[PDB]
Amino acid sequence: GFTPPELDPNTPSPIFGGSTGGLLRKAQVEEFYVITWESPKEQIFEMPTGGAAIMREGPNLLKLARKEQCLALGTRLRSKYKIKYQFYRVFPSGEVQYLHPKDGVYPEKVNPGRQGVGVNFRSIGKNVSPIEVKFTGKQPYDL
Amino acid sequence: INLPSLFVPLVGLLFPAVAMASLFLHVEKRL
Amino acid sequence: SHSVKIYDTCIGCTQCVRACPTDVLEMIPWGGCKAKQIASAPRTEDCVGCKRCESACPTDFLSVRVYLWHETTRSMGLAY
Amino acid sequence: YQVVQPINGDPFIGSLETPVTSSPLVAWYLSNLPGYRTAVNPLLRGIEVGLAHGFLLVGPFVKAGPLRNTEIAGQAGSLAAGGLVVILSICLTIYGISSFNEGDPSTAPSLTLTGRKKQPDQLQTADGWAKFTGGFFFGGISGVTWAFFLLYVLDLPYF
Amino acid sequence: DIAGLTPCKDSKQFAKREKQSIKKLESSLKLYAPDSAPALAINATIEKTKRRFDNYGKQGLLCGADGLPHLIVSGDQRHWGEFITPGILFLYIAGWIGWVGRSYLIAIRDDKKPTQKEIIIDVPLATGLVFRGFSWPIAAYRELLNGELVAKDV
Amino acid sequence: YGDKSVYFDLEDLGNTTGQWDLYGSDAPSPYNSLQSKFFETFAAPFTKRGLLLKFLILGGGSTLAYFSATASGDILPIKKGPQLPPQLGPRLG
Amino acid sequence: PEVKILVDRDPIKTSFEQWAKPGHFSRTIAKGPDTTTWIWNLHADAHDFDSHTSDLEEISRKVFSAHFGQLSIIFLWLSGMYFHGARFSNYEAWLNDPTHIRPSAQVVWPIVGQEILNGDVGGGFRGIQITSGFFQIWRASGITSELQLYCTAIGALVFAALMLFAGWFHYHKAAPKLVWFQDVESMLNHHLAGLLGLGSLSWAGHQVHVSLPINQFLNAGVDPKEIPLPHEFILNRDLLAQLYPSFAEGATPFFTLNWSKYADFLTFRGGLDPLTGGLWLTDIAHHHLAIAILFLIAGHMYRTNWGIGHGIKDILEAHKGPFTGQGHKGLYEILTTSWHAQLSINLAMLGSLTIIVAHHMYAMPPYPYLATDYGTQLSLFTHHMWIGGFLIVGAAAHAAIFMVRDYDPTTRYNDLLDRVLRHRDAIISHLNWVCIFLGFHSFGLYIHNDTMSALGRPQDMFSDTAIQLQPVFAQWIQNTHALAPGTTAPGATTSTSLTWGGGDLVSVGGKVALLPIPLGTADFLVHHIHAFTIHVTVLILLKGVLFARSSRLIPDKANLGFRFPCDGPGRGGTCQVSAWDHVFLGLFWMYNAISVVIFHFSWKMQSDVWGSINDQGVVTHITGGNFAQSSITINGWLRDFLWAQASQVIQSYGSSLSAYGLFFLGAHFVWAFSLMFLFSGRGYWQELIESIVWAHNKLKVAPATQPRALSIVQGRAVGVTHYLLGGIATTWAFFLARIIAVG
Numbered sequence A: 001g002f003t004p005p006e007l008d009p010n011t012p013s014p015i016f017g018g019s020t021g022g023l024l025r026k027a028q029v030e031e032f033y034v035i036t037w038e039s040p041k042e043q044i045f046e047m048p049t050g051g052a053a054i055m056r057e058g059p060n061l062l063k064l065a066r067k068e069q070c071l072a073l074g075t076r077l078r079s080k081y082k083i084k085y086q087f088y089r090v091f092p093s094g095e096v097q098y099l100h101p102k103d104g105v106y107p108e109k110v111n112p113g114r115q116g117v118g119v120n121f122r123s124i125g126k127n128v129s130p131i132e133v134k135f136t137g138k139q140p141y142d143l
Numbered sequence B: 001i002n003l004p005s006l007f008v009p010l011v012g013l014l015f016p017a018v019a020m021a022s023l024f025l026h027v028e029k030r031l
Numbered sequence C: 001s002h003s004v005k006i007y008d009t010c011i012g013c014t015q016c017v018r019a020c021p022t023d024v025l026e027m028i029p030w031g032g033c034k035a036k037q038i039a040s041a042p043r044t045e046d047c048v049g050c051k052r053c054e055s056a057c058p059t060d061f062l063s064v065r066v067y068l069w070h071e072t073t074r075s076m077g078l079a080y
Numbered sequence D: 001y002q003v004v005q006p007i008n009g010d011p012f013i014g015s016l017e018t019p020v021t022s023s024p025l026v027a028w029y030l031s032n033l034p035g036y037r038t039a040v041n042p043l044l045r046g047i048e049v050g051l052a053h054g055f056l057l058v059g060p061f062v063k064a065g066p067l068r069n070t071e072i073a074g075q076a077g078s079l080a081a082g083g084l085v086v087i088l089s090i091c092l093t094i095y096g097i098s099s100f101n102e103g104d105p106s107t108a109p110s111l112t113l114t115g116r117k118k119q120p121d122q123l124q125t126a127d128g129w130a131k132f133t134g135g136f137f138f139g140g141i142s143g144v145t146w147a148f149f150l151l152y153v154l155d156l157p158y159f
Numbered sequence E: 001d002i003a004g005l006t007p008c009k010d011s012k013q014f015a016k017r018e019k020q021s022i023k024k025l026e027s028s029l030k031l032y033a034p035d036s037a038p039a040l041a042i043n044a045t046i047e048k049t050k051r052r053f054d055n056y057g058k059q060g061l062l063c064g065a066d067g068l069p070h071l072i073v074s075g076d077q078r079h080w081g082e083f084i085t086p087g088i089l090f091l092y093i094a095g096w097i098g099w100v101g102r103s104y105l106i107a108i109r110d111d112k113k114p115t116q117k118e119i120i121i122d123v124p125l126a127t128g129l130v131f132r133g134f135s136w137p138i139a140a141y142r143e144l145l146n147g148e149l150v151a152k153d154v
Numbered sequence F: 001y002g003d004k005s006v007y008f009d010l011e012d013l014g015n016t017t018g019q020w021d022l023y024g025s026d027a028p029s030p031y032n033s034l035q036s037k038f039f040e041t042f043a044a045p046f047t048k049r050g051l052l053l054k055f056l057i058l059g060g061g062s063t064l065a066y067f068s069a070t071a072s073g074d075i076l077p078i079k080k081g082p083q084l085p086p087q088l089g090p091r092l093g
Numbered sequence G: 001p002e003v004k005i006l007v008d009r010d011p012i013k014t015s016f017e018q019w020a021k022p023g024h025f026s027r028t029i030a031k032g033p034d035t036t037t038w039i040w041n042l043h044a045d046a047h048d049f050d051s052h053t054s055d056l057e058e059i060s061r062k063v064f065s066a067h068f069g070q071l072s073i074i075f076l077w078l079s080g081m082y083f084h085g086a087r088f089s090n091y092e093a094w095l096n097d098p099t100h101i102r103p104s105a106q107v108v109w110p111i112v113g114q115e116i117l118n119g120d121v122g123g124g125f126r127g128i129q130i131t132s133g134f135f136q137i138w139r140a141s142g143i144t145s146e147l148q149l150y151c152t153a154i155g156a157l158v159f160a161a162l163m164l165f166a167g168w169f170h171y172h173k174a175a176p177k178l179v180w181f182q183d184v185e186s187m188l189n190h191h192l193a194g195l196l197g198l199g200s201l202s203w204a205g206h207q208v209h210v211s212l213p214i215n216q217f218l219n220a221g222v223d224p225k226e227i228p229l230p231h232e233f234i235l236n237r238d239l240l241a242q243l244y245p246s247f248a249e250g251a252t253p254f255f256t257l258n259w260s261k262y263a264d265f266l267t268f269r270g271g272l273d274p275l276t277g278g279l280w281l282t283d284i285a286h287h288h289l290a291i292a293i294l295f296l297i298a299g300h301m302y303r304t305n306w307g308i309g310h311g312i313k314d315i316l317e318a319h320k321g322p323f324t325g326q327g328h329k330g331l332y333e334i335l336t337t338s339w340h341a342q343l344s345i346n347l348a349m350l351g352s353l354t355i356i357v358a359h360h361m362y363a364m365p366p367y368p369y370l371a372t373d374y375g376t377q378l379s380l381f382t383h384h385m386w387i388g389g390f391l392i393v394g395a396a397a398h399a400a401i402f403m404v405r406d407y408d409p410t411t412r413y414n415d416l417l418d419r420v421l422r423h424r425d426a427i428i429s430h431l432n433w434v435c436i437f438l439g440f441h442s443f444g445l446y447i448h449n450d451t452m453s454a455l456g457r458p459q460d461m462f463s464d465t466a467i468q469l470q471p472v473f474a475q476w477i478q479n480t481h482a483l484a485p486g487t488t489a490p491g492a493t494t495s496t497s498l499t500w501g502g503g504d505l506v507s508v509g510g511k512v513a514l515l516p517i518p519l520g521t522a523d524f525l526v527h528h529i530h531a532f533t534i535h536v537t538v539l540i541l542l543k544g545v546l547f548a549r550s551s552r553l554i555p556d557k558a559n560l561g562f563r564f565p566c567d568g569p570g571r572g573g574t575c576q577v578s579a580w581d582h583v584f585l586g587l588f589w590m591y592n593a594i595s596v597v598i599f600h601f602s603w604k605m606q607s608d609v610w611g612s613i614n615d616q617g618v619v620t621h622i623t624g625g626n627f628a629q630s631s632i633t634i635n636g637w638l639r640d641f642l643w644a645q646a647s648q649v650i651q652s653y654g655s656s657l658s659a660y661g662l663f664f665l666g667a668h669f670v671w672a673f674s675l676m677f678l679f680s681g682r683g684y685w686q687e688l689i690e691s692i693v694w695a696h697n698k699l700k701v702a703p704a705t706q707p708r709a710l711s712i713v714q715g716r717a718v719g720v721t722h723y724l725l726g727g728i729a730t731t732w733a734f735f736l737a738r739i740i741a742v743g
Ligand code: CLA
Pocket: B003, B004, B005, B007, B008, B009, B011, B012
């Protein structure tokens, strides 16, 4: 069921000159993200944190401090260029966790192997009044 | 001997120091 | 963690999914409409509470709702 | 030839390498400071730091104080420095109390600038920090007294 | 009299104000040629000021301790000229305006592109409609009685 | 890590996340042992967190209390008091 | 490669088709409107040509003809000024006696009693005293009759017509194409040499033949109607030879290179004319001559068609060093394909220039009888300060627009821009620290002074008598300037100004034109306040520019566009995270800075320079040096400046300065009104308009264009514009009423 690709260190990363928008202490102590793509040729692309970098012909692996920054770079790579990307989340443990695209197909394309999470079978106008859930820990929408 | 001479520094200088040190200590670490 | 809910008025346009910055939403099979599709929120632990998804919902009222809730460092979008 | 390089050659860590940040003499100087003397007992570093800071606090307090014109200018300003150094110690002790615990290891980095292991700096522990702040306070009162002894108690030609 | 005020024509402070006002303008007329443009203009406004005070006196206004003509709006019939007849005139004119606007809005509400006739006025239709405001009171009364002034269904 | 172009390796996350110490010395105590043995013997009783905090607070408190309850008139005009007769208010006084 | 005129014939046919259609340029607008928001959008994007299309050629053609339209508007304004000076003025009476008659070139019609505004300005005339300083310009140009003013007004009218026609022509009949605009070498060659070089040479030619002799005659005391007409000075030359003997040789000195034989009317005196209180005209003529020579040579630097010259690309890409990589390589391609880059550069430079102009004009009064006309001086300084500030803020606005819309490292890559984008965080952090430090050590000194004074401890205060903060550098510099003439500028007799020193007070008609301005502790404090405010507004604007494309907060800020409300209340709240919002603040801080600057100027001038001279040489100033001791605490500003100076405007009612009192109160009102837009949000207003719409629908009177509350950005725009209008207008009224009453 779509064994996710395993992160391959020794994959080169784009030619960058350095920036003050890179990683910080949060990447040291809690987590950071890593995105990979494959680059038909060596080109210039705008970095989601600073200026411009040069993606190498062949595997490109970039480490960002925010998942949102990764998805932004992924969107730019995917529609301005035509490049398929995947990103992971790395903990200070040395664990990696394949993040996107979760089940091999982009989420804008329906896949028959996904379950419904957080779906309510009613229209939004049929939530109970807050008075109905007073003094119980539940929220009227979580129902 | 002049009672203000003692209570106005202690309540204006010491007491906020002690209270704020203690309240910072209480608010800013995990139990 | 903010809480995102999907309601059955969803027409499965998928514009909201294509709008979210953090890949919280998804498209899943269904039978209640002509697209046989509906939006799911399996990864709300990454939701920043941006609510771009609500501005992309063409239904009235909305079919995708974001209720801001307890904050995490993921929820607050902090890089430090 | 280019002067500014990414840190240690890693272009995805949020910082750079420049003259002010990383030129030979400025690195040697910063490394030769008590705060960055990692392999030294924290109490002596606190002593050196506290003595230097205490001496400094006497300079402006006395000259810029409200009793500068009065004959007790020296006594007054020096006493104010003692009040300030003690307040700094209170800030230091409560910081160490809030941010550290005895059963926990040092939060300092284990790696050097070359990728070699090294003993984590003990100043970032609980009692390492306690020894450091004790030394700092002892040094700070000693510095204020030393600076306060030099002028007023002894003529000694200044300005 | 009413509210302790006194008829400006017989008040003393009202006169004193008139004489003081007239006095300063006369000073402005001086230091110039006796029959110059500026001097002629100053004279004109002096006569205008005298006419305004006499007109106030003639109309029977009420003056207080400052000599300023106070206005009574309680409904006393000696004073309808101060508020109530101007009020009826205003209500007439404002009903004219509002009724013409409402008439226009109703008339253009039936096209496919009604907003087109709102950012760009149909002036022929507007000029056909403006003069119904003249009879707006009767029209509005009969529309209320008909029950068609207020939209039902809302 | 640092093999020509790569900068990412799971085995050494700290190097990858820049967990360096850019200025620490890793050198021996520059202070002579004799001097070290003089300080850490006299400055020892001040290195207990709760002890130092409590003593600091209370000692400084009584310090301030004594120095202000027994300040002389030439230090604070607030304790010297007025030296002139008082004026009268616009009507009262 | 070579440069030529390149045109296109009849690109758009003049027609009334699109006038009938509202927002033809915007596809969405063209169709029509569903709600009230459509009307606001129509105006907000009328002149944003680079979004109506994507063709650079069309953008630049539109820009060219819009410039023509603006020039026409300016000419119409000038002709209106000249005509009002010709017909509804007392310019001739003022010309007979300058320092007793008050200039005024506007009268009002006696409609509702407003003729009280026709005050006594002297000269058998009743009008509104003007502060434009136009009378001084006309006198310095040699204009003695109102026939000359009439001729000038009509000439400017036909020039406005010509400009409007050229605007129509160069857009609908003969519109240039892109390669014509993208030629900047020849454009610079022509603007340096042709517009500024020939322009200033032509003006020096005017002053040599018209202003110099006519002003000589006027200063000799001749009745203005007994003066020869200017053309006589050209026909009969011995008329000039009498005033200026060395007009006898007649241009042979210019070719013998015996230029010293011209020393008569081409001087290097410096200082002021003791008779008129302005600069020597024989100095201004020499100045414009030298300026002309300089610009005429300078417009020959860039290569156009004949090999000689400089390629701007070569000059740019020759400059690079070890700190900046390949700097300046690729800027020529950036500055010739994006109008916003050029616009922001030019706006920054023009604002800087306007403020320099204000300073130099207050310090070295160029026009006769200008220095002792205190109202004109104050108004000119204040007006130019405001204009400069607004332009400088617009510079930042358009730098941000460039960064968002036109910056592209894929096709147009520059190194320096990239490096600054790469260490923007260091830049902004250090600017932040500087702002904080400067704010503590300038305003903190004022707060310390206020409490030291309120605790009855003036000895502890930061003042000239307790704790001196003397600006030793400014004092040293101005003493160096005072000693300059004869020591290190040997050809000058007087120092370039009288604020430097040397004594030599100059007065005119019993009023003080100029005297040495002393710098004490209060000057130190207020100068550091100025530095602080400028640094903070720079921080806001630079932070907006550097972080316009992306940040650590929202990683794709450019996709949201240059101007937008927010991206939801996520990540904690992203209200005003856009570049446009940064400009909105900068305007607030620009207002603060310029307000403090003009207050400083006005108080310092009314306290240490202006005033009345007397028979012994005793100078009583407007305020007896109350700036040196009262300006050091905020209570002094509130009491001695605002409360004291404010009394003039409050008592204006019942006189001819009543309009200033009215504008004072009205500006207070509109300023307070702005706060309704600046403190609230559009959600409340939409919800209220909902029930108002209900009330209308109940009576079949609801409109079809659905009324919406304003956009979030529009509400901020309405709030900031009203705020600025209110504040600037109340300061305007206060200044004018005060300086016209006490001046
Ligand atoms: C709410 C009532 C109240 C208020 C507003 C004040 C206010 C003031 N008192 Mg005071 N006082 C009070 C009650 C109060 N007192 C009572 C009931 C007593 C006992 C009879 C005293 C005895 C007292 C003395 C001896 C002196 C003052 C003095 C002062 C002045 C200096 C400030 C100070 O030193 O704090 C007050 C110092 C104290 C020792 C007060 C302690 C007694 C109260 C009950 C403490 C309450 C603390 C409580 C836990 C917190 C309450 C919560 C709330 C107030 C926030 C100040 C204006 C000094 C002065 O005269 O200034 C010139 C002075 O020397 N007070």
